[PDB]
């Protein structure tokens, strides 16, 4: 399998661009930055609002937990390459603690509104707008030969007052190389594409489009998360129960993939369900025909069938967002 767009970005670019293991970090001054308060945390980092004591400007301080040095150079390189792109969080400095060697990545300040509280209040138009803005981030990183691999609401920071969006946490992102076999243990379970769940390792940018589709579905149907499985096997079951197993067999046959006799027994047999089966009073309107057409074009087993980020941006679902942007 290979990506249908941007397959050659790293083929044409100098090894300097994608050879992150060869990166040698230039450490800044750790004293330039003071923690103000913790604002987030995860398996790989703790995140704080900080202050740059030189200019007294706010910033974000991401303190990295112990991991392989290669993963640290990878995130740094990718952030450097993407810095300046639309709606990509900006890495401004990198520092570390002399004694412990604990590294911290310093980012432009981002003022997040918690998605669990934000999403319920989003209007129809807000959803179209924020998804369009996210799509800019994704087409951009894809055009620069990079897959995010962890698209989920937690990694989409939104300052709703200023209608600003930033795609964050590039700690799982990777460079795309045609034919390369990647680790499938990426992305949060609810947002794992079928390719990850059936061990198709030569995947690409289209992985991010499945994860986006999951986010979108959760938004318009007001179900968080949309595909709610308890482990990876169960996650594939939840997908099969909606998309149907006929399509799954076609997918697996196309890519010559064999399912575990165990996993296969679990998945069983399911008809494809219509997207409107999930419409209800809390969500009936968020679920217009254009929303369903667009969603349906993202949530496809076959990664090669999914809309690209660029295509997605042009779907008529977003026509008003485009019109409003053009008039500016
Ligand atoms: C709860 C929370 C609030 C944030 O503002 C950030 C994060 C989490 C966060 O995880 C994060 C990761 C990152 O790689 C860059 C960031 O700017 C961030 C963040 O800015
Ligand atoms: Cl930098």
From Swiss-Prot:
Reaction it catalyzes: L-seryl-[protein] + ATP = O-phospho-L-seryl-[protein] + ADP + H(+); L-threonyl-[protein] + ATP = O-phospho-L-threonyl-[protein] + ADP + H(+)
GO BP annotation list: DNA damage response; regulation of cell cycle
Keywords for the protein's UniProt record, in alphabetical order: ATP-binding, Kinase, Nucleotide-binding, Serine/threonine-protein kinase, Transferase
Gene Ontology molecular function: ATP binding; protein serine kinase activity; protein serine/threonine kinase activity
Record EC number: 2.7.11.1
Binding locations of ATP: 39-47, 62
Active site: 150 (proton acceptor)
Highest rank taxon of the organism: Eukaryota
Paired cysteines (S-S): none
Subunit structure: Tetramer of two alpha and two beta chains (possible).
Recorded family membership: Belongs to the protein kinase superfamily. Ser/Thr protein kinase family. CK2 subfamily.
Name listed for the protein in its UniProt record: Casein kinase II subunit alpha
The organism of origin for this protein: Zea mays
